[PDB]
Design a protein around this motif. Structure first.
Motif, short mmCIF file in Angstrom:
data_model
loop_
_atom_site.label_atom_id
_atom_site.label_comp_id
_atom_site.label_asym_id
_atom_site.label_seq_id
_atom_site.Cartn_x
_atom_site.Cartn_y
_atom_site.Cartn_z
N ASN A 136 -7.89 -2.45 0.63
CA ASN A 136 -7.44 -2.61 -0.74
C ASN A 136 -7.68 -4.03 -1.24
OD1 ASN A 136 -5.25 -3.46 -2.76
ND2 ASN A 136 -5.10 -1.23 -2.86
N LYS A 142 -10.23 -5.22 -4.29
CA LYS A 142 -9.82 -6.03 -5.44
C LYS A 142 -10.63 -7.32 -5.53
CE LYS A 142 -5.41 -6.11 -4.35
NZ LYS A 142 -3.96 -6.47 -4.46
N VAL A 201 0.81 -1.21 0.00
CA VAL A 201 0.00 0.00 0.00
C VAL A 201 0.85 1.26 0.00
CG1 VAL A 201 -1.80 1.22 1.30
CG2 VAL A 201 -1.85 -1.27 1.12
#
Lengths: 65, 155, 115, 32
Positions: free
Chosen positions: C56, C60, C37
């Motif tokens: 994140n 995804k 990240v």
RNA sequence: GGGAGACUGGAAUUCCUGGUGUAGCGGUGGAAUGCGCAGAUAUCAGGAGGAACACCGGUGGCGAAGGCGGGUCUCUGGGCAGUAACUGACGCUGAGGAGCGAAAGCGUGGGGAGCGAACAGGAUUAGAUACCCUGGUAGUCCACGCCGUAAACGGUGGGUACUAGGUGUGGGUUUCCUUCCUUGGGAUCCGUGCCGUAGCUAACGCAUUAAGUACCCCGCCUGGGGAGUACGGCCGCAAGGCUAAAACUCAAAGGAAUUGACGGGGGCCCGCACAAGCGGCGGAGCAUGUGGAUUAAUUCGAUGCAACGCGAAGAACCUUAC
């Protein structure tokens, strides 16, 4: 301190054939309980421990569920 | 504050509008030790709002303070190598005074050349909740409920 | 790939936090670690990095269309709970929080002490 | 008792051990 | 869980093979060596190999001391209580001597997953042959023998009898209110802890498990260093162990408790110390002081807090000391 269950004249014989009786003395993770929780004498405590180990050996109880 | 809670000075009721709210407001907008200036300023803003919206000033000021009300403050406490932002519930009086400080500061942030109308404009738009203060207050609840993970420290 | 149900493996140690979304058969869909990240060095153990990596990875995986997730967690405490909140806020349904951390039965020998 | 006596004894012993270490081959050759 | 032999169970670590799968993983006070992008970490399934036995598990059990807990089977030693049937003082200690004896170490042949002296880099530091990080050989394991040393400690040799009690736990036999359900209670033999009388001690403490009152037997001490060293000898493959002085030198070396001081030791309590708030500084110009640099001199003093708009509440001359 609670009295020993098997020290009574009418107690059951400790054996690895009986699974419910050993199901009583194991925790929710499959571990063996102490003898302060139960209060049973030293001798009966070690018979319970040996019976639980044998039951795990012959695949009647999980190895730490 | 080591020994114990300190006494709070009682508020003086307003002579004209008869509310502790307006005297608290003039005290927070008070500066340089000149009560006359800020006092006539708050009178001008009050009368401007009254003549603009044509409503009751006291009730719309309570409406504005309710619309700029915070709910759950965030405060930093030191542990484990870092400062964590623990949320704490706020008693009404502190919430009111800090919201009034917010609205006074944001009125000072308006850029129409004189606050005698800036504060009135802030009052009327806070009655609609259209100013930057109310949106930033919504942002404050956003952060407060976003950092709810540290609900076990209870500091 | 379109899969309705899956699972999330979160491994948190004193140095990093790694999140991986997998099928119920173990095949990995997407992963996001605490250093992917944008954190380098000692900073990738903080709860903020855990939250960022978790969200994140969840996003995804959601791009692949994951709906409900059973989370398995592991390791000492760095960003466990923060990761759970991050997945629950990114738009994923948690079904069960299972903590499967390895525990030896007095096998092998641990390294020596730090002085 | 105190530890000063123990460390005096250990210091003498360690010096003797080092002296024995320094001259093993010479002692071997000379003894035979 | 006293010992020996054989078979055998599960978790976990490492490695190999095959899926999913991307650009980071590892480590730290912070990092860098390092592992990857030739497919790592992660996550599934299968296989190989070695070592140790989580929960029961403790101031609890056994053993002469070392020491001993995954399960089962085979062989085997010791202790306790009850009955007192048997022998009839057959006892105690035991210089020498023999046997056993943690860990490390040595020899021969296997094994080698994890850990890890020596050895390499990385880091810190004025230097780091270290502490911290990454790898890593002997070794740790097995079979058969050597060495025989430890803070091998209860710093407390073995045997016997006597001397207020209170309170837990381990093993076994008995009488009585008795539900004989029951740690109901008492009595009694052997252990294992805590507190406390007399007594002892320099004090600390010991105190029926004596460091108290007495008898028997063995071992050991005679100021601190030189020194458990040299010489001679025995043992050992080696490392080394055992027995064991002198010349010389000091006027001391020590044990226990007391009072202060100190700690990069803890525990409490205060203070605008933080916290909640208001107003500033560090930003520009100007006024004062200081450091630094020139100068003939730029007089002297003040240098964390506790010096720096301070001696100076008055430098054109006079102050003035240059």
């Amino acid at each position: 301190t609670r009295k020993c269950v098997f020290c009574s004249k009418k107690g059951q014989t400790i054996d690895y054939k009986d699974t419910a009786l050993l199901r009583t003395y194991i925790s929710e993770r499959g571990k063996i309980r102490a003898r302060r929780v139960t209060g049973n004498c030293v001798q009966h405590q070690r018979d319970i421990a040996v019976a639980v180990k044998n039951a795990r050996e012959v695949a009647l109880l999980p190895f730490g569920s | 504050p080591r020994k114990g809670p300190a006494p709070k000075r009682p508020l003086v009721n307003d002579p004209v509008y008869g509310s502790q709210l307006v005297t608290q407001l003039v005290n927070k907008v008070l500066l340089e030790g000149k009560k006359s200036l800020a006092e006539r300023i708050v009178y001008g803003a009050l009368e401007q709002a009254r003549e603009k919206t044509g409503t009751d000033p006291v009730v719309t000021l309570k409406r504005a303070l309710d619309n700029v009300k915070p709910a759950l403050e965030v405060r930093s406490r030191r542990v484990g190598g870092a400062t964590y932002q623990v949320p704490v519930e706020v008693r009404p009086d502190r919430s009111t005074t800090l919201a009034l400080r917010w609205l006074v500061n944001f009125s000072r942030q308006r850029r129409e050349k004189t606050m005698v109308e800036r504060l009135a404009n802030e009052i009327l738009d806070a009655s609609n909740g259209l100013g930057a203060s109310v949106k930033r207050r919504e942002d404050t609840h956003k952060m407060a409920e976003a950092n709810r993970a540290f609900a076990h420290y209870r500091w | 790939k379109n899969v309705p149900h899956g699972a999330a493996h979160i491994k948190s140690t004193f140095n990093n936090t790694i999140v991986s979304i997998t099928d119920p058969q173990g095949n990995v869909i997407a992963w996001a670690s605490s250093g992917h990240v944008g954190f380098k060095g000692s900073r990738k153990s903080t709860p903020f990095a855990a939250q960022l990596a978790a969200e994140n990875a969840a996003r995804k995986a959601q791009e692949h269309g994951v709906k409900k997730v059973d989370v398995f967690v592991k390791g000492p405490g760095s960003g466990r709970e923060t990761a759970i909140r991050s997945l629950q806020a990114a738009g994923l349904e948690v079904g069960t929080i299972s903590d499967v951390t390895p525990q030896p039965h007095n096998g092998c020998r641990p390294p020596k002490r730090r002085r | 008792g105190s530890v000063i006596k123990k460390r005096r004894k250990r210091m003498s012993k360690k010096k003797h051990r080092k002296l024995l270490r320094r001259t093993r081959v010479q002692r071997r050759k000379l003894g035979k």
